[PDB]
Amino acid sequence: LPTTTVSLSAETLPDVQAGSVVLYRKFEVGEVITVRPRANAFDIDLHIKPEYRNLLTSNSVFWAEGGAKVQLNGSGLTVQASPLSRALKGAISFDNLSGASASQRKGDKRILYASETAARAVGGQITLHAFDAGKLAVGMPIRYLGIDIGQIQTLDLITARNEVQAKAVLYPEYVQTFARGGTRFSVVTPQISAAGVEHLDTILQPYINVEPGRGNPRRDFELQEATITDSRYLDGLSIIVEAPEAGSLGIGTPVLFRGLEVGTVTGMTLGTLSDRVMIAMRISKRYQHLVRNNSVFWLASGYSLDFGLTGGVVKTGTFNQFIRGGIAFATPPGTPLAPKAQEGKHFLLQESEPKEWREWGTALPK
Amino acid sequence: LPTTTVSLSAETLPDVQAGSVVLYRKFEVGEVITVRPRANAFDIDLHIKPEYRNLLTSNSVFWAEGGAKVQLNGSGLTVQASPLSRALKGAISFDNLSGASASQRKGDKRILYASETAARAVGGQITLHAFDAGKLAVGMPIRYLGIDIGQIQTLDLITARNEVQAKAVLYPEYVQTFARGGTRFSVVTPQISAAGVEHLDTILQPYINVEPGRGNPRRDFELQEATITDSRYLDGLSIIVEAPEAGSLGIGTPVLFRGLEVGTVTGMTLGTLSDRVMIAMRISKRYQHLVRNNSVFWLASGYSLDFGLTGGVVKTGTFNQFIRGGIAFATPPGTPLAPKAQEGKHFLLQESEPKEWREWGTALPK
């Protein structure tokens, strides 16, 4: 009987027997010897060949792969039964991960995770409180600008507090950047309507989008409904326009200057005294020089058709403001240009769309 | 010929035969001896090894394994055939469930369930009365906030009472929270329209949504058409507005304050004297302090175009109130603020949309 190089441990051993092949992520380097239950878990004894024992380091993670799989995707039809023992008794893969052996490996032994993802789920652990786990799933990736930052580990249903606590994890090189005071998460869902489709990849692979923030390390967040997808306006002038009613505005609605997209709406609070919606926006740092201290903001949301007694021409356009209610810019004329707007600046939505706007032509140098 | 440890019983024999391995939830602890029918039910005799005969307790459920594991995710079709040494041999599995063996595994013998899920279906049994079983199916999950609470077990067609009695089951940890006076169930269906899609995961995997309630143990409910999906507004102020006509309102239409969703509409009854539709609402516990005792509610449903004599501008916006007719708040100004509204409070839908609302600016501290 071969000597046990390493001994794993797992409740509900994931389809492994005596004789399952142990392969270094693509290449057989050992074999499973014995499987013995102890109290309520199982000891799984591996035997790495002596000329490959160097591949087994301290920060190694093991996971089961099962038998043959016939994955069919864009890469053609890839069959995976390359060793006869994998397709007959199962397999156990392993790899060397940087950042493992932190708080889950010491004291008894390593753990044979049931899948490949569950082994990769290493790093700082956060807690995502959500109101409905219908959009969530175990192992769902957490992404920033399309790159995976971490994943969801569990989905608990707390019933006293009627919410779902989803424990996630951020990979160790992102736990410092994210997991700060003001980061926000939200499940990206497909958007199929008459006015176009987007996020069609989230039909079969939904993910969680993240928007970072500055502040104290939090490690305990709340899943939101929407989030700015791209970081085009992450840096840049943050300002706040006050409106007596939010209405057609939402997160991500564009902020327009002369009809070009300049910034987006990031949040719609309700103010301390609940009498004004504090619409928080982020003007791009490329157009930060346009937000002067006397700029007037107005609501370019939907169509505003004209009217005339003897004659009134009507205008339609095709603006996405009828799809996502935009906010519009203006700078009134004057030779001593008002100073640039600071960060903590509060404007007021002028519901009137100043009629002499198009003939202003205020010079705004960079 | 080994000795028979436990005798089973199953209908529609699931591809197991003499020699099939009995594995302890993944670990082989015995084998099937013989498969015989006696009157109409296949008896199936097992033989657990003597060192594992303690793992077979009173609350142990058996189920037939087998079959591939197709998995349609973002990386392809990915059919899996994890075992082969046992796949071509057949394998029934078993495990000890906390709360099993209530009134069904005792008296004659256990039952070999055709799949793993049907075996786990243990707990308190409820009866859902439906009007159309076209949306339901045996084994369909019952979810609360997305976590499975139980599942459907049967689908009977009572012809006397022209309805369908669908016996379900709630897992023993949730049979106390639900199975109360005010819980309501409803099948969640895909909604694909020009206004957008949602619940696209119910195309291949529908479920039944639950909203808990406070009341006496019921154990006998009726399936409904709509339910509040998330528990964002479960805890919170639940008030009632009276209207001469419901019309555009329905379960789930938002309750708006300055245009922000603050609550939802949870029910539309008709009242004792059938002359006033009683729209039941739930204001969130976060914005509960806004519902003052003198607040005026109005109907922000659809679009309402203007009409002017000398100069009249028409507005369209982009409101989802044209999709889900919203109800809006207002609090008239006053220095001795009226007290906060209690739970059983009855307002009146003032259809006029108070004209000077946007200039009220009532300070509502928290």
Curated annotation (Swiss-Prot), chains A, B:
Sequence segments annotated as region (MCE/MlaD 7): 235-351
Impact upon substituting I192N: Does not affect function
Region (MCE/MlaD 5): 4-114
Outcome of gene disruption: The letAB mutant is not sensitive to lauryl sulfobetaine (LSB), but the pqiAB-letAB double mutant is more sensitive to LSB than the pqiAB mutant. Double mutation also increases sensitivity of the pqiAB mutant to caprylyl sulfobetaine.
Family: Belongs to the PqiB family.
Localization of this protein: Cell inner membrane
Domain notes: The seven MCE (Mammalian Cell Entry) domains of a single protomer of LetB resemble seven beads on a string. Six copies of this linearly configured protomer associate laterally to form a homohexameric assembly. The LetB hexamers form an elongated tube consisting of seven stacked MCE rings, each formed from the association of six identical MCE domains, with a central tunnel. Rings 1, 5, 6 and 7 are dynamic and adopt open and closed states.
Subunit structure: Homohexamer. May interact with LetA in the inner membrane. May also interact with partners in the outer membrane.
Region described as MCE/MlaD 6: spans on this chain: 123-226
Entry function: Forms a tunnel that spans the entire periplasmic space. Is probably involved in the transport of lipids between the inner membrane and the outer membrane through the tunnel. Forms a dynamic tunnel sufficiently long to mediate lipid transport directly between the two membranes without the need for a shuttle protein. Binds phospholipids. Lipids bind inside the tunnel. Required for outer membrane homeostasis. Contributes to membrane integrity.
Origin species: Escherichia coli (strain K12)
Protein name listed in UniProt: Lipophilic envelope-spanning tunnel protein B
UniProt effect for mutating P190N: Loss of activity
